Amino acid sequence: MTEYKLVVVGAPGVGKSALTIQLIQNHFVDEYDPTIEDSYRKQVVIDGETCLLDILDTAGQEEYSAMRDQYMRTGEGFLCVFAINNTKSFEDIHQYREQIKRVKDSDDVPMVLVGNKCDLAGRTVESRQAQDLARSYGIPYIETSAKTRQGVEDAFYTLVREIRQH
């Protein structure tokens, strides 16, 4: 069956893992539990197609840089996550996007911009400025909460459909 190699990237603490586990395990993780590298494989049906989601959950620290080019070159689509309560994480997105273009040799790689933690009241990144960013990248923007499970499947399925039209 069709397999789709999705990679979840973003600054430390933005909720990369919480999003992935919500999707795979249908629960929200509230623990402090830094990722080195985690892999998830799940048979799903998306718009009638039976496919396997092969998801690589990454670290965002500078440690993981070398290890980073390796997984970026094999990923077919990337979830670029920031936290809406964290302006530095929003600004970091540009760093991840430009590394992915570098290793993929491509101005256009299947990508979704994900503003996570949208359940939180103390937002410091406006949805309008994340939406102008995404438009300038020519990619979709989707706001998610791993807590309420708002937007989680939307963010992942949208990325799969971007890979499909590539």
Q: Which is nearer to its own copies, 100 or 113 (CB)?
A: 113
- x/- track of binding to ligand GCP for residues 59-98 (CB under 6 A): xx--------------------------------------
Is residue 153 within the footprint of ligand GCP (CB under 6 A)? no
Half-sphere exposure in the Cβ direction for 103 (13 Å, CA): 18
Number of residues that bind Mg ion (CB under 5 A): 3
Give the shortest CB-52-to-its own copies separation in angstroms.
Answer: 16
For ligand GCP, which residue of 44, 46, 103, 119 counts as binding (CB under 6 A)?
A: 119
Question: Residue 114 pairs with which residues in a beta bridge?
Answer: 81, 142
Is residue 131 within the footprint of its own copies (CB under 8 A)? yes
Question: Which has the closest alpha carbon to 6: 141, 161, 153, 159?
Answer: 159
For ligand GCP, which residue of 96, 116, 134, 139 counts as binding (CB under 6 A)?
A: 116
Is residue 126 within the footprint of its own copies (CB under 8 A)? yes
